[PDB]
Amino acid sequence: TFQVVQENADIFWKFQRYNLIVEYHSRPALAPPFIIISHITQALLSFIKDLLERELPSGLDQKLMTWETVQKENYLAKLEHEHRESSGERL
Amino acid sequence: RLGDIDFTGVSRTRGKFVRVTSSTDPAEIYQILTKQWGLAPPHLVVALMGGDEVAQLKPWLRDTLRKGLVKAAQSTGAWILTSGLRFGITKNLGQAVRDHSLASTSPKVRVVAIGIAPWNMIQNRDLLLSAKPDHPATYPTEDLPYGAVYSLDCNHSHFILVDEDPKRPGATGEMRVKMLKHISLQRTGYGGTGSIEIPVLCLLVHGEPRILQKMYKNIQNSIPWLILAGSGGVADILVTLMDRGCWDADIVQELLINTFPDGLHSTEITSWTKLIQRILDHGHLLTVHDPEQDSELDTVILKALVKACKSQSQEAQDFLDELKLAVAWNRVDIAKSEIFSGDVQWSAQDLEEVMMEALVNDKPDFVRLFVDNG
Amino acid sequence: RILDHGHLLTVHDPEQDSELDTVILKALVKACKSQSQEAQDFLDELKLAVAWNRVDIAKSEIFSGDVQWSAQDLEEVMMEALVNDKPDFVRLFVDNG
Ligand SMILES: [Ca+2]
Ligand SMILES: [Ca+2]
């Protein structure tokens, strides 16, 4: 079971590590029991008044989608090329 | 006369322009392009002729054409001279150039799309007539049918607006030919204390009989020409007449009639047949690009340039810029088959410069070739 | 006289052909090509080629350049090729206008 499971276990760990790292975005920097200070501060700020998931300006967003399309075209061209000079296609 | 454009529409693009007349010298416009706008002297110039007719190319043909042109121009710094009006193949090539510019991670190399358009065929020229240096003029980009007057292409970075000549309403093609000759006669510095010509090529897509005089004048000016296979018009006539091998008055007239029903006049058709026959009689400046079989635009450009210069002269020092362009495209096979074929004597001093640029630019195959060749 | 017609005659050799739909398509395309040059008549041969998934014959004989294909003419055959799970003809029609 170890020999046949290790790889899928590692992939699952990477997926879980994503969520674990995302959990720290809203997590206060103070550990318990000092986290009561952070909880009170946030509650008071809410009552009185991220690296991930960012919105970009229109120009940069268009540039990035154009770059993505160019990279996809390169990927497809490389796939079709490595298919075209394969041994079976040559035969 | 100099100005700037703030294109309003799909994308906000900043473009410049110059208003010129048929009386101005091309050298002044070249100096403006080099200095006043910061455009470095290119390693390749590709002129676009035709493609403004009612019938546009098939989507696959124009896509493969634009992709091949942009990929061949990105290895070096090249100008793609177009008719800077947003319609048809010019619009598609401008869009491809803009896409390459946006997707490029290296800004040192630049593919510049320069538009040479008449003043009397532009939408809303009065809007840009002011061109305040402090506040650039704003231009709305409108898509239009074939019509008779177009709008400036937004994706074209720079423009050269030619003013209509009262004597003859054909100053646009005349100025295009004059500029093609002038850049073809430039000698940019090569490495250190070296003189390198600028290779200048003309590509024809779906030509019309009206541009035969301009095409012949570019043939006279030693400008190699490249012909698309399935372009549709004069390109089909030229490729058929090349495949047949022998062109006569009857064949040329019959093909012109079959492709162009409209032309029915003894003098006009006779002049067009004479132009076709003489252009084919040149021959060595003419090349056929068939994307269904070629699939490599840089290869056919290199072959056309090598054939043109090989017919021009035999000395090694003239193949220097074709060899540099082959180095930039990593076309070692063509270099050893056509340039290093034994018909040309290569010394060590001649090969030293190209050795230096091949060694600097990460081209091991050419390093090995130059070590093997002296 | 039958041989003098010729263009309406096709030979199927199963020892060498091994594809009856291919030779039927070729015979129909040749017959209609001799009949007329307009694109609107190749419409049913093109539909039959779509149904048989003969993209090679369609691009070699129908989309050969001798016939001018517009967008309105290709719209219907595009619709039936897209509905009937024929991606190759979808790509061909997108590439042809
Ligand atoms: Ca030369
Ligand atoms: Ca029919």
PDB file of N, CA and C in Angstrom, chain B residues 203-264:
ATOM      1  N   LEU B 203       6.349  41.800 -50.513  1.00  0.00           N
ATOM      2  CA  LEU B 203       5.445  40.660 -50.522  1.00  0.00           C
ATOM      3  C   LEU B 203       4.119  41.085 -51.136  1.00  0.00           C
ATOM      4  N   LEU B 204       3.667  40.339 -52.139  1.00  0.00           N
ATOM      5  CA  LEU B 204       2.458  40.665 -52.884  1.00  0.00           C
ATOM      6  C   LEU B 204       1.337  39.713 -52.494  1.00  0.00           C
ATOM      7  N   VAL B 205       0.174  40.273 -52.172  1.00  0.00           N
ATOM      8  CA  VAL B 205      -1.018  39.496 -51.850  1.00  0.00           C
ATOM      9  C   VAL B 205      -2.182  40.053 -52.667  1.00  0.00           C
ATOM     10  N   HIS B 206      -2.771  39.205 -53.510  1.00  0.00           N
ATOM     11  CA  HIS B 206      -3.948  39.535 -54.314  1.00  0.00           C
ATOM     12  C   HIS B 206      -3.777  40.878 -55.024  1.00  0.00           C
ATOM     13  N   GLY B 207      -2.777  40.930 -55.897  1.00  0.00           N
ATOM     14  CA  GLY B 207      -2.489  42.156 -56.606  1.00  0.00           C
ATOM     15  C   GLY B 207      -3.555  42.506 -57.625  1.00  0.00           C
ATOM     16  N   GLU B 208      -3.603  43.790 -57.963  1.00  0.00           N
ATOM     17  CA  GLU B 208      -4.479  44.338 -58.983  1.00  0.00           C
ATOM     18  C   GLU B 208      -3.660  44.792 -60.189  1.00  0.00           C
ATOM     19  N   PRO B 209      -4.247  44.810 -61.389  1.00  0.00           N
ATOM     20  CA  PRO B 209      -3.488  45.280 -62.560  1.00  0.00           C
ATOM     21  C   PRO B 209      -3.068  46.736 -62.465  1.00  0.00           C
ATOM     22  N   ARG B 210      -3.717  47.529 -61.607  1.00  0.00           N
ATOM     23  CA  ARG B 210      -3.361  48.934 -61.458  1.00  0.00           C
ATOM     24  C   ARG B 210      -1.997  49.130 -60.808  1.00  0.00           C
ATOM     25  N   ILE B 211      -1.509  48.150 -60.046  1.00  0.00           N
ATOM     26  CA  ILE B 211      -0.236  48.269 -59.345  1.00  0.00           C
ATOM     27  C   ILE B 211       0.911  47.650 -60.136  1.00  0.00           C
ATOM     28  N   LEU B 212       0.671  47.277 -61.395  1.00  0.00           N
ATOM     29  CA  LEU B 212       1.715  46.638 -62.189  1.00  0.00           C
ATOM     30  C   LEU B 212       2.871  47.592 -62.461  1.00  0.00           C
ATOM     31  N   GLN B 213       2.569  48.867 -62.713  1.00  0.00           N
ATOM     32  CA  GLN B 213       3.631  49.845 -62.929  1.00  0.00           C
ATOM     33  C   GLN B 213       4.505  49.993 -61.689  1.00  0.00           C
ATOM     34  N   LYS B 214       3.886  50.081 -60.510  1.00  0.00           N
ATOM     35  CA  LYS B 214       4.656  50.193 -59.277  1.00  0.00           C
ATOM     36  C   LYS B 214       5.478  48.936 -59.024  1.00  0.00           C
ATOM     37  N   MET B 215       4.900  47.763 -59.287  1.00  0.00           N
ATOM     38  CA  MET B 215       5.650  46.523 -59.114  1.00  0.00           C
ATOM     39  C   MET B 215       6.851  46.478 -60.047  1.00  0.00           C
ATOM     40  N   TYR B 216       6.666  46.892 -61.303  1.00  0.00           N
ATOM     41  CA  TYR B 216       7.778  46.946 -62.246  1.00  0.00           C
ATOM     42  C   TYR B 216       8.844  47.933 -61.792  1.00  0.00           C
ATOM     43  N   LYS B 217       8.435  49.075 -61.236  1.00  0.00           N
ATOM     44  CA  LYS B 217       9.416  50.051 -60.774  1.00  0.00           C
ATOM     45  C   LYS B 217      10.209  49.514 -59.589  1.00  0.00           C
ATOM     46  N   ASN B 218       9.557  48.750 -58.708  1.00  0.00           N
ATOM     47  CA  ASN B 218      10.299  48.092 -57.635  1.00  0.00           C
ATOM     48  C   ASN B 218      11.226  47.010 -58.182  1.00  0.00           C
ATOM     49  N   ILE B 219      10.814  46.324 -59.251  1.00  0.00           N
ATOM     50  CA  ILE B 219      11.710  45.373 -59.911  1.00  0.00           C
ATOM     51  C   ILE B 219      12.945  46.085 -60.448  1.00  0.00           C
ATOM     52  N   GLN B 220      12.756  47.253 -61.070  1.00  0.00           N
ATOM     53  CA  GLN B 220      13.894  48.019 -61.570  1.00  0.00           C
ATOM     54  C   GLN B 220      14.857  48.394 -60.452  1.00  0.00           C
ATOM     55  N   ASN B 221      14.342  48.681 -59.261  1.00  0.00           N
ATOM     56  CA  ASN B 221      15.165  49.116 -58.142  1.00  0.00           C
ATOM     57  C   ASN B 221      15.790  47.958 -57.371  1.00  0.00           C
ATOM     58  N   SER B 222      15.888  46.777 -57.984  1.00  0.00           N
ATOM     59  CA  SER B 222      16.549  45.617 -57.385  1.00  0.00           C
ATOM     60  C   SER B 222      15.936  45.247 -56.036  1.00  0.00           C
ATOM     61  N   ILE B 223      14.611  45.282 -55.960  1.00  0.00           N
ATOM     62  CA  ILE B 223      13.882  44.880 -54.762  1.00  0.00           C
ATOM     63  C   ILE B 223      13.317  43.484 -55.003  1.00  0.00           C
ATOM     64  N   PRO B 224      13.833  42.450 -54.341  1.00  0.00           N
ATOM     65  CA  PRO B 224      13.269  41.107 -54.523  1.00  0.00           C
ATOM     66  C   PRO B 224      11.815  41.060 -54.078  1.00  0.00           C
ATOM     67  N   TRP B 225      11.020  40.269 -54.792  1.00  0.00           N
ATOM     68  CA  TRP B 225       9.590  40.171 -54.550  1.00  0.00           C
ATOM     69  C   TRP B 225       9.221  38.753 -54.144  1.00  0.00           C
ATOM     70  N   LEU B 226       8.212  38.648 -53.285  1.00  0.00           N
ATOM     71  CA  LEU B 226       7.710  37.370 -52.806  1.00  0.00           C
ATOM     72  C   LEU B 226       6.221  37.286 -53.104  1.00  0.00           C
ATOM     73  N   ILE B 227       5.783  36.133 -53.606  1.00  0.00           N
ATOM     74  CA  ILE B 227       4.430  35.958 -54.121  1.00  0.00           C
ATOM     75  C   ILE B 227       3.737  34.853 -53.338  1.00  0.00           C
ATOM     76  N   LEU B 228       2.547  35.146 -52.821  1.00  0.00           N
ATOM     77  CA  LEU B 228       1.718  34.119 -52.207  1.00  0.00           C
ATOM     78  C   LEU B 228       1.052  33.258 -53.275  1.00  0.00           C
ATOM     79  N   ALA B 229       0.864  31.979 -52.947  1.00  0.00           N
ATOM     80  CA  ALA B 229       0.318  31.037 -53.919  1.00  0.00           C
ATOM     81  C   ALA B 229      -1.164  31.292 -54.166  1.00  0.00           C
ATOM     82  N   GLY B 230      -1.982  31.184 -53.121  1.00  0.00           N
ATOM     83  CA  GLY B 230      -3.419  31.300 -53.272  1.00  0.00           C
ATOM     84  C   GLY B 230      -3.977  32.675 -52.965  1.00  0.00           C
ATOM     85  N   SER B 231      -3.186  33.721 -53.218  1.00  0.00           N
ATOM     86  CA  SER B 231      -3.633  35.076 -52.909  1.00  0.00           C
ATOM     87  C   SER B 231      -4.868  35.455 -53.720  1.00  0.00           C
ATOM     88  N   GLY B 232      -4.885  35.128 -55.010  1.00  0.00           N
ATOM     89  CA  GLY B 232      -6.106  35.270 -55.780  1.00  0.00           C
ATOM     90  C   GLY B 232      -6.021  36.032 -57.088  1.00  0.00           C
ATOM     91  N   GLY B 233      -5.237  37.105 -57.133  1.00  0.00           N
ATOM     92  CA  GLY B 233      -5.243  37.973 -58.296  1.00  0.00           C
ATOM     93  C   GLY B 233      -4.004  37.886 -59.159  1.00  0.00           C
ATOM     94  N   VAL B 234      -3.203  38.956 -59.163  1.00  0.00           N
ATOM     95  CA  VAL B 234      -1.957  38.960 -59.924  1.00  0.00           C
ATOM     96  C   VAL B 234      -1.014  37.879 -59.414  1.00  0.00           C
ATOM     97  N   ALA B 235      -1.124  37.518 -58.134  1.00  0.00           N
ATOM     98  CA  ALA B 235      -0.290  36.454 -57.587  1.00  0.00           C
ATOM     99  C   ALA B 235      -0.563  35.126 -58.284  1.00  0.00           C
ATOM    100  N   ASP B 236      -1.842  34.798 -58.501  1.00  0.00           N
ATOM    101  CA  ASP B 236      -2.174  33.574 -59.223  1.00  0.00           C
ATOM    102  C   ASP B 236      -1.618  33.602 -60.639  1.00  0.00           C
ATOM    103  N   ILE B 237      -1.749  34.741 -61.320  1.00  0.00           N
ATOM    104  CA  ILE B 237      -1.232  34.860 -62.680  1.00  0.00           C
ATOM    105  C   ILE B 237       0.270  34.618 -62.693  1.00  0.00           C
ATOM    106  N   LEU B 238       0.987  35.245 -61.757  1.00  0.00           N
ATOM    107  CA  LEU B 238       2.438  35.111 -61.721  1.00  0.00           C
ATOM    108  C   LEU B 238       2.863  33.681 -61.408  1.00  0.00           C
ATOM    109  N   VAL B 239       2.204  33.027 -60.447  1.00  0.00           N
ATOM    110  CA  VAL B 239       2.616  31.668 -60.100  1.00  0.00           C
ATOM    111  C   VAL B 239       2.303  30.703 -61.240  1.00  0.00           C
ATOM    112  N   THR B 240       1.167  30.889 -61.920  1.00  0.00           N
ATOM    113  CA  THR B 240       0.853  30.039 -63.066  1.00  0.00           C
ATOM    114  C   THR B 240       1.850  30.251 -64.199  1.00  0.00           C
ATOM    115  N   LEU B 241       2.221  31.506 -64.461  1.00  0.00           N
ATOM    116  CA  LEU B 241       3.155  31.791 -65.544  1.00  0.00           C
ATOM    117  C   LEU B 241       4.559  31.303 -65.208  1.00  0.00           C
ATOM    118  N   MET B 242       4.902  31.254 -63.919  1.00  0.00           N
ATOM    119  CA  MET B 242       6.180  30.674 -63.523  1.00  0.00           C
ATOM    120  C   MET B 242       6.166  29.157 -63.640  1.00  0.00           C
ATOM    121  N   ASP B 243       5.058  28.519 -63.252  1.00  0.00           N
ATOM    122  CA  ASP B 243       4.968  27.065 -63.343  1.00  0.00           C
ATOM    123  C   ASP B 243       4.972  26.602 -64.794  1.00  0.00           C
ATOM    124  N   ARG B 244       4.291  27.341 -65.674  1.00  0.00           N
ATOM    125  CA  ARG B 244       4.289  26.985 -67.089  1.00  0.00           C
ATOM    126  C   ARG B 244       5.689  27.078 -67.684  1.00  0.00           C
ATOM    127  N   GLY B 245       6.467  28.078 -67.269  1.00  0.00           N
ATOM    128  CA  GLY B 245       7.830  28.254 -67.707  1.00  0.00           C
ATOM    129  C   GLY B 245       7.995  29.230 -68.854  1.00  0.00           C
ATOM    130  N   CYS B 246       7.083  29.210 -69.821  1.00  0.00           N
ATOM    131  CA  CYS B 246       7.122  30.110 -70.965  1.00  0.00           C
ATOM    132  C   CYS B 246       5.877  30.985 -70.944  1.00  0.00           C
ATOM    133  N   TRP B 247       6.077  32.299 -70.983  1.00  0.00           N
ATOM    134  CA  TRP B 247       4.986  33.264 -71.006  1.00  0.00           C
ATOM    135  C   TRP B 247       5.014  34.016 -72.327  1.00  0.00           C
ATOM    136  N   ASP B 248       3.866  34.073 -72.996  1.00  0.00           N
ATOM    137  CA  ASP B 248       3.719  34.786 -74.256  1.00  0.00           C
ATOM    138  C   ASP B 248       2.573  35.780 -74.129  1.00  0.00           C
ATOM    139  N   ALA B 249       2.324  36.519 -75.212  1.00  0.00           N
ATOM    140  CA  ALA B 249       1.236  37.490 -75.205  1.00  0.00           C
ATOM    141  C   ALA B 249      -0.115  36.808 -75.038  1.00  0.00           C
ATOM    142  N   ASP B 250      -0.327  35.691 -75.738  1.00  0.00           N
ATOM    143  CA  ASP B 250      -1.617  35.009 -75.681  1.00  0.00           C
ATOM    144  C   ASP B 250      -1.910  34.491 -74.279  1.00  0.00           C
ATOM    145  N   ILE B 251      -0.931  33.832 -73.653  1.00  0.00           N
ATOM    146  CA  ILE B 251      -1.148  33.262 -72.326  1.00  0.00           C
ATOM    147  C   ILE B 251      -1.398  34.361 -71.301  1.00  0.00           C
ATOM    148  N   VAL B 252      -0.585  35.420 -71.335  1.00  0.00           N
ATOM    149  CA  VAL B 252      -0.742  36.513 -70.381  1.00  0.00           C
ATOM    150  C   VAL B 252      -2.097  37.183 -70.557  1.00  0.00           C
ATOM    151  N   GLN B 253      -2.485  37.454 -71.807  1.00  0.00           N
ATOM    152  CA  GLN B 253      -3.771  38.094 -72.062  1.00  0.00           C
ATOM    153  C   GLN B 253      -4.929  37.211 -71.610  1.00  0.00           C
ATOM    154  N   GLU B 254      -4.851  35.906 -71.887  1.00  0.00           N
ATOM    155  CA  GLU B 254      -5.929  35.005 -71.497  1.00  0.00           C
ATOM    156  C   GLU B 254      -6.057  34.918 -69.982  1.00  0.00           C
ATOM    157  N   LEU B 255      -4.930  34.811 -69.273  1.00  0.00           N
ATOM    158  CA  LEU B 255      -4.988  34.753 -67.816  1.00  0.00           C
ATOM    159  C   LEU B 255      -5.503  36.062 -67.231  1.00  0.00           C
ATOM    160  N   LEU B 256      -5.066  37.198 -67.782  1.00  0.00           N
ATOM    161  CA  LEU B 256      -5.549  38.488 -67.300  1.00  0.00           C
ATOM    162  C   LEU B 256      -7.049  38.630 -67.520  1.00  0.00           C
ATOM    163  N   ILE B 257      -7.545  38.178 -68.674  1.00  0.00           N
ATOM    164  CA  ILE B 257      -8.979  38.232 -68.940  1.00  0.00           C
ATOM    165  C   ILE B 257      -9.735  37.324 -67.980  1.00  0.00           C
ATOM    166  N   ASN B 258      -9.228  36.107 -67.765  1.00  0.00           N
ATOM    167  CA  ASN B 258      -9.925  35.149 -66.912  1.00  0.00           C
ATOM    168  C   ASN B 258      -9.997  35.638 -65.470  1.00  0.00           C
ATOM    169  N   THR B 259      -8.905  36.200 -64.955  1.00  0.00           N
ATOM    170  CA  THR B 259      -8.901  36.714 -63.591  1.00  0.00           C
ATOM    171  C   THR B 259      -9.525  38.097 -63.459  1.00  0.00           C
ATOM    172  N   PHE B 260      -9.465  38.926 -64.499  1.00  0.00           N
ATOM    173  CA  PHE B 260      -9.969  40.301 -64.435  1.00  0.00           C
ATOM    174  C   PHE B 260     -10.903  40.566 -65.607  1.00  0.00           C
ATOM    175  N   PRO B 261     -12.177  40.182 -65.484  1.00  0.00           N
ATOM    176  CA  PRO B 261     -13.143  40.502 -66.549  1.00  0.00           C
ATOM    177  C   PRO B 261     -13.260  41.986 -66.851  1.00  0.00           C
ATOM    178  N   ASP B 262     -13.088  42.852 -65.847  1.00  0.00           N
ATOM    179  CA  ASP B 262     -13.400  44.268 -66.015  1.00  0.00           C
ATOM    180  C   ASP B 262     -12.542  44.917 -67.095  1.00  0.00           C
ATOM    181  N   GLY B 263     -11.251  44.603 -67.123  1.00  0.00           N
ATOM    182  CA  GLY B 263     -10.350  45.221 -68.077  1.00  0.00           C
ATOM    183  C   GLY B 263     -10.613  44.824 -69.515  1.00  0.00           C
ATOM    184  N   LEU B 264     -11.131  45.763 -70.308  1.00  0.00           N
ATOM    185  CA  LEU B 264     -11.400  45.555 -71.731  1.00  0.00           C
ATOM    186  C   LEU B 264     -10.994  46.825 -72.472  1.00  0.00           C
TER     187      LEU B 264
END
